[PDB]
Amino acid sequence: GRTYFESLCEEEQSLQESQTHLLNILDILSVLADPDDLLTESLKKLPDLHRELINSSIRLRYDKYQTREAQLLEDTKTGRDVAAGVQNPKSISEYYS
Amino acid sequence: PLSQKQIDQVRTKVHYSEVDTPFNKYLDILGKVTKLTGSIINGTLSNDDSKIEKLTEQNISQLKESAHLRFLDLQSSIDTKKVADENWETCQQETLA
Amino acid sequence: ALSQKVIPPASPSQASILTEEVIRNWPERSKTLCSDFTALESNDEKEDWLRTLFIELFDFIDVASFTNELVNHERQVSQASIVGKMFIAVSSTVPNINDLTTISLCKLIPSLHEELFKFSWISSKLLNKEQTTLLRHLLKK
Amino acid sequence: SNTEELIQNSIGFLQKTFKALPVSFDSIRHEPLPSSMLHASVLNFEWEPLEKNISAIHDRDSLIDIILKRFIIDSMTLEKGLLNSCIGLDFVYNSRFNRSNPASWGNTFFELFSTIIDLLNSPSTFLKFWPYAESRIEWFKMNTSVEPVSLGESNLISYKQPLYEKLRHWNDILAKLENNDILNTVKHYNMKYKLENFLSELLPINEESNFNRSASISALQESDNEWNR
Amino acid sequence: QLTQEDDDYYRKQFILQLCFTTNLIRNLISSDETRNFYKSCYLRENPL
């Protein structure tokens, strides 16, 4: 979470896990709501996925906050800061004069 | 009569407002599915009496389609913005050179 | 006949492993937790543990918890960033169960008071009609 | 799964169909693509897959929106990508009547526009692309109505659903371009001017956000940007 | 730039700047009606 770009990649990598958890839970719920001994296995496997989805979502929001912070920190660097490091001012001053 | 601390507080609130619709949509679907999951885990979930879900197996495919669409949308969104940032960085380096 | 809605599987309350034991022995346990938090390195890993603690905390719900959050935040001010405040700001909205108890608890704690203005739903705290009018104008401008 | 392969087939079919057309880039920069140049099959949303009719019935409009977005994105990442993007951006205008909710084209159209404004490499490309957006202004001014507006009347507001985020975003871009102030090539000033003029022409003169409320401008210095000082 | 006797446009810019600003200052001082508007504008963005 050093810069805008890395924070963005990390947010995406968390989104992926959240998505796969959601898809598994939707599949299990569609199986359970389908028109025994299968529904018991479904309702048994459910809570493990439940207390994984919450972790994924919490982490996702944390990264979203962090990347908003990083972007806003990046946007304050003005042009003079980036331009203070130029090597030879002499040629530049000659040019402008 | 408003003091200084209150003014600084409202200033920091305005300086951080963001409106990102795909993200809010994805998180909305996350909430709308985890509420139903937790309700079914409770066992007295509903018969669509309250406004938390509908167990009807005729809208489950709607939930899956919406999940896929919103996930893809948010994915494309963060992809676009990171590409735009890389492009701005490249152009700044070019003009500095 | 929509569903049996009969649930044979069940889970007992053996959770809160990191926030373990009785809340009894309160100050010794609280100082131990603060010391353990300050101990950890590799900030990332810290965040992980925090999640557990915080959700465990919201299992219970109070003023003692608010004082504990005060100690945690104040200990975190020594460093540059503020991770505890952001993680409370998310894990307050993320869980399934909630109420206005969160509004009151946030109204009580003054340390992360500005972090709450930053990210969460803080329309409540900034209640001075002058403040909200200034807010509408500053936003629209 | 089903939807992913559906989208892949659809994007392939779209790429082929749009590669078929002959319209050159400079021809479309100034003249709108007429409706005749496309078969009524491509319109009305009767396309190649047409197999998940019951499955894809759930959300129809959104599907076209996301597949068009992905098309624009993958083509943009030129004189060819710009051509495909412009053709898609005109297609979404021409296919309005067939949509389920005809008004919903507005928030769709603008949406795509924003995306492509983001993907342009450098202000050179932005100035090469702008004559398009200056050609089809009168399409922006109708937020939801499907019939053209009388020349000189706009129905856009600062806080309405279409502009609620777009004005915020374009003001962000303007602020960032203003913030450089040292490393600004003339291309940058030309770009900022084009943008401010576009936005100022969109909203009417009278809107609450089209005339400043008494802000006396600081940063008026005319120095040689900390060179030869 | 300013004292050349052959390029007079810079002096025209300076004179124009003075005239604009003095116009505003005079209206501010004398009118006592725009003063209320500018006071309101300064206040609303910053009550202090």
Quick check: C96 contacting B, CB < 8 Å?
yes
Q: How far is CA C17 from the centre of its chain?
A: 17
Chain B: closest CA distance from residue E27 (Å): 31
Resolution (A): 3.4
Chain E: closest CA distance from residue B11 (Å): 10
8 Å CB contact of D165 and B61: no
Cα→Cα distances C90→A37, C21, C118, D33, E11, Å: 38, 26, 12, 49, 61
Tell me the Ramachandran region of residue D47: left when phi exceeds 0, alpha when psi lies from -120 to 50, beta otherwise.
beta
How many angstroms separate the CA atoms of D115 and B81, rounded? 9
Q: Residues with Cβ < 8 Å from A11, sequence gap 6 or more?
A: A60, A63, A64, A67, B78
Hunting for tokens 């005729």 — which residue is that?
A: B58
Query: Cα Rg for chain E, rounded, in angstroms?
Result: 17
Closest CA to D69 of B82, A22, A15, B79: B79
Residues on chain A touching C50 (C-beta within 8 angstroms) = none
Which residue of D lies nearest to A92 if distances are taken between CA atoms?
Answer: D227
DSSP state of D32: P
Hunting for tokens 């009767």 — which residue is that?
A: D46
D156 within 8 A of D202, measured Cβ to Cβ: yes
Cα→Cα distances C24→C64, C72, D55, Å: 12, 19, 57
DSSP state of D150: P
A60 within 8 A of A18, measured Cβ to Cβ: yes
A22 within 8 A of B67, measured Cβ to Cβ: yes
* B/E interface, count of CB pairs below 8 Å: 6
Quick check: D228 contacting A, CB < 8 Å?
yes
Closest CA to B91 of D191, C38, D169: D191
The method recorded for this entry reads cryo-EM
8 Å CB contact of D181 and A79: yes
Chain D: closest CA distance from residue C119 (Å): 18
For residue A40, the surrounding DSSP H or E stretch is helix A39-74
How many angstroms separate the CA atoms of A91 and D227, rounded? 10
* A/C interface, count of CB pairs below 8 Å: 34
